[PDB]
Amino acid sequence: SLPSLAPDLVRDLIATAADISLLVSQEGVVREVMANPHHPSFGQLSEWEGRPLEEVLTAESVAKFRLRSEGLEPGRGSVAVELNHIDPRSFEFPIRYILHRLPADRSILMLGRDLRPIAEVQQQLVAAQLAMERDYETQREMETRYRVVLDVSRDPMVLVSMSTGRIVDLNSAAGLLLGGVRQDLLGAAIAQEFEGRRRGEFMETMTNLAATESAAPVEVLARRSQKRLLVVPRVFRAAGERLLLCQIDPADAGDELSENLARLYHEGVDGIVFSDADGTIRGANEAFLNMTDSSSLAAIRGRSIADFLARGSVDLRVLIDSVRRTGQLRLYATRLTTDFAGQIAAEISATWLDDRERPLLVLVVRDTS
Amino acid sequence: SLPSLAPDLVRDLIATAADISLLVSQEGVVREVMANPHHPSFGQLSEWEGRPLEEVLTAESVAKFRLRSEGLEPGRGSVAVELNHIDPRSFEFPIRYILHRLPADRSILMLGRDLRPIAEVQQQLVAAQLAMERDYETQREMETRYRVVLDVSRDPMVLVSMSTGRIVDLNSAAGLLLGGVRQDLLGAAIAQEFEGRRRGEFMETMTNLAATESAAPVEVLARRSQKRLLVVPRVFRAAGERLLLCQIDPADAVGDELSENLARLYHEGVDGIVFSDADGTIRGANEAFLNMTDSSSLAAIRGRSIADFLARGSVDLRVLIDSVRRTGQLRLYATRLTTDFAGQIAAEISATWLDDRERPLLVLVVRDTS
Amino acid sequence: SLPSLAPDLVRDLIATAADISLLVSQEGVVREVMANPHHPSFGQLSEWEGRPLEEVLTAESVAKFRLRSEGLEPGRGSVAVELNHIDPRSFEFPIRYILHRLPADRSILMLGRDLRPIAEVQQQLVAAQLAMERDYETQREMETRYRVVLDVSRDPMVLVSMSTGRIVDLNSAAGLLLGGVRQDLLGAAIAQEFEGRRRGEFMETMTNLAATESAAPVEVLARRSQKRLLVVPRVFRAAGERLLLCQIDPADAVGDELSENLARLYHEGVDGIVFSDADGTIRGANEAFLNMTDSSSLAAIRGRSIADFLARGSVDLRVLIDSVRRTGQLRLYATRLTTDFAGQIAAEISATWLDDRERPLLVLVVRDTS
Amino acid sequence: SLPSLAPDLVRDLIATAADISLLVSQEGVVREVMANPHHPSFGQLSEWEGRPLEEVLTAESVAKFRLRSEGLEPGRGSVAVELNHIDPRSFEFPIRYILHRLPADRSILMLGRDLRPIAEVQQQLVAAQLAMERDYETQREMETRYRVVLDVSRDPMVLVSMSTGRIVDLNSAAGLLLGGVRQDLLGAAIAQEFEGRRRGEFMETMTNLAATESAAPVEVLARRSQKRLLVVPRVFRAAGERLLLCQIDPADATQPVGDELSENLARLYHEGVDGIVFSDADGTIRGANEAFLNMTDSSSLAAIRGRSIADFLARGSVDLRVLIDSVRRTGQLRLYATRLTTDFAGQIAAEISATWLDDRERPLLVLVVRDTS
């Protein structure tokens, strides 16, 4: 049993065991307010002392208090009831008060437990659940969108896993060109759908082609279809993982000039570089990439052409001065530099593409032994 | 000003103020266990009485309790500490105790807050976090796949909000047909882009789509582009809301930037370009090569043979062609251009073999060297 | 003998039998130049008609033509001489003439075999051989340098084919970590040297980590040595084809803890981190930023502007840069990120202006909010 | 402007102009052989006379000949065609024939230009072309392999010419040790990078030291870097040229130097606006930056190093358990809203991201803490 306890100590024990306690007199006025030294931002509850209980509790709460305390006699029994404080700045959440009728002056000691912790954690859980709701809804929305766009599209596309080399999706057009209904090609290793090809080397061909960004397609023969097909690859990172999207056209299917020009670009031995008026590379063909030992078009796109010229600023100054003077630089000799400090012999020619908004540069770069 | 109370009433007040409380002797023995009758049960803890406190605490909590409480003095303050109990039924449960040391016998009175509800919500919080992460990742994947498929597709497509009538998405092909860029066409009113006779005639088709989920494909005229187009509409449901997906066909039968700039290089470039058949018979030539060979017209040298322009003649033809037909590319070839009138020119030629099943082509890039 | 022929027929037979032929008067004046339409262009040499032959010859060719012509008499057979003509400005072209003296004029008929296709070819070929010998010496040198640098290096390296997945080269150090003689590992599929890996998924791990440039290496177990190893990929392009370079280190074997921890927060942390120049030019970014922005690689965004990834675009970067430039710090800058495929990701950026008097730096911690 | 020429003189002109000229009736029989006089070795081709012009031609050349012949008009022009004969050997030899059909007898006069020397030249030139291109590709691949294996290798290396003593190549690692950029050190005397060394004595030192099997690293002082370094030499021959290879290491393995990224990260931590905390697996703090200290009204980093994260979280233990139990599972936690403790029993709203840094004996927790007050 508890030893000899003094009233001071008892007041402290109650003040630390409960979160807030009130000694309300028999007449309904608050005589003593015992807040917790360990409860957040307290000691500012001193106002309640001397005030009636109706200035500290909502009306309904006062009513519940009255009702539970109607028959509450001293010495035999105690009762628990949830009451709410008016000021949410003191106690935003309801308090579980355990009521005792005191023997001497028939005052009532209210011992309170703040629901605040449990309530705020559980509210956090509710918040989380609603967030998850909107999350799955948006996920399903975008899923439907991607589905409709891929299926409706008249452009034959196939999505291949960069880790497995197997088809993860496609549309009915790609299936038509390949010779299998969508269900049959799902999961089928793409490289095996083409005669004479293997996973490793075919994926390497696709991936390198994508990095180059050449529009020169890979000629393939579909096993099921026996159709000569052309495959144009693109690599993209979705949610941190890389995927491979192939566009497929069948082969054998005026204006020959533009065609042959594009072919000159993607297949030509001379490097060609398009660039803003300040040398900023906008695009370049496979030849310039191979020449510079560049990992990919995207790697150089956005950089200054000076990063690949041996003289650096001097070369860029010459290009710009000539091309801005006569519109043309005929033959300029310098060295191309790779990002591993290599040096190639190069001869450059260049032309200003007369524009009001986007003045371009087209540079023909030739490897000269 | 709290009135003095009988030790029994004090006992009951302490037991009801806390959710659970323990009275522990100085030497560490649990002397009494006090339950809050208005609080959810902890089990029959009455067995604890007369037994050492460490028997009902985890090892971590034993060490904690000992570290926190030993410094405690009567009336010199109290300490808070979270402890994990072991019930007689071998289960565990957390409590946040406030420790006081009593003047009479230096015993420790432990005033606890129940931590069971909070831990309960905590597990669910952990699970929720995991789910939110996986959901977010799946979202990102699907949205990226959508945007990539849309951008890449050569089928000109436009996505219109049925609710607002404004363009909600599109690709650069539909941009090329409409006569603008994604950023500019984005948000545009659809009836002000697809034009027929009588202003916003397209809104009639919109009306048909709103109640049918489909409509007969319509001939319109791209406002920005002044191109005669043909629009195939259909409606689906994403996230409950309805969205129009339009396909676009040019009524007649769209060159991108690269084709135009390559054309610019051909006609305005300094280096000569010559296209010929496998016979070396010239199919096409650019103005650089024309001004290089003092040729009057593109039409005058078209059909002629490459040999009539190369110093070594038949030899040069055969070497260029037979070399590229093996490698596909010839990096640098030095020769001379024979001129109809002027002196022959010192040239350097690169060559590429553009293979084809039907009409193979040789392409030459011809440079004047001093 | 042969059937008698009209004068015109005779002229055309002579003209087509020779590659080119000159009729030079007794005095030395070129009366007529007869071209072979079946034979590659010489240019228009009809402008020699009227001038003396000696002015379209070299000095040596002049003396030689004198020597062969002066003795030549009508009906006394024919002789041969090789002359070099001189181009307008100022090249040359060699013809092998056979000289006849006509009994009617005492003029000289010169019948030409074209030497342009043949001239100086052989000398060129000798030069090509010598050039090849030199090239070969250089190759030998570079080969030895490569071997010595690879083998002597204390950095365990393995070169892997991207098309076959097999090891094409490695040093003795890598050979020690892998637990195999060089001759056993040469040609071996790299994946199968590590427990629980396959060619496809492993090559994807390596390629992707190389593109990411994260210093967070891949843990593997070497099959032969049974040692835990750490691998760091490198992908380069050599002569048009791609290669994989692997740096290997033992997992159980730098001076600063805070520095390593920070390195790890960077390469492995969830928040996107970008270091840029004062003008917004991206100097670096972590894997998290690449993943948030759907960027293929660190290389693809390096050198480019932060504004490329802001939805507001330029104006956004203006407000951000200026704010952080004066204020020094910015705790919650709310905007929208973009991807190369026109996405819009809500995000919250915290920016710090690392103030250096020479080259100031801008660091952004980027967080995907919803 | 051709004079009146005698018929046999014309026959001679045609004979000497061309290399070998054939007359053949409309049927296809070799009437006469008019080989070039100045080429005496063609004299034996006369045996073709009396034979059809197909026992001395290839079938392809036969076809071509037939077509081009039946195409021509007599007294309207001519036509060139490449044919292949059968010489006195088994060889086939090419000739550019110019077909003129005579209005005299409908017979065809063939005017032959020997195409052999041109042919030989074509094959030789093509062979040379292809050879040089392949050689180029080979060179480029090998040189590139070399370049990257050198650049990437963390083993700091300098390659010196034995003949000149000048640095011919190196890598970034070595450059960092010497205190120079790549382009500053190329061509430089190697001896003049190390404080108080002369060429000759240095080259002989390195050579002799290389000759020693149980060698010892030579401590040197890099002139630019001012670093004490250790140099280990290996001498090898490369294509008749002696080269010196130098592996370099710092004499002090303590100082790690670090790179630009390390620097930048340090500046991010010490000076950045976000709070950053590294704790152990149980959440006791190992390190915290100034922003976190200011965020929580902490007195110092010393005064909170060793405390649990829960000491600064409003809801305490639960927030910690949620964070840790979450990242241990996922690896990363993107965003966790919560509340921090500030002085005078105060609080501020905060968004924490978490990342679990795995390890075998020291798993680490990292939190990037944002004040979202």
From TrEMBL, chains B, C:
Residues annotated as domain PAS: 142-194
MF-aspect GO terms: identical protein binding; sequence-specific DNA binding
Domain of life from the UniProt record: Bacteria
Protein name in the entry: Transcriptional regulator, PpsR
Species classification: Bacteria, Pseudomonadati, Pseudomonadota, Alphaproteobacteria, Rhodobacterales
Residue span relative to the full protein: 6 to 378 of 464
From TrEMBL, chain D:
Gene that this sequence comes from: ppsR
Domain PAS residue range list: 142-194
GO molecular function: identical protein binding; sequence-specific DNA binding
Residues included from the entire protein: 6 to 378 of 464
Domain of life, per lineage: Bacteria
Lineage of origin: Bacteria, Pseudomonadati, Pseudomonadota, Alphaproteobacteria, Rhodobacterales
Name by which UniProt lists this protein: Transcriptional regulator, PpsR
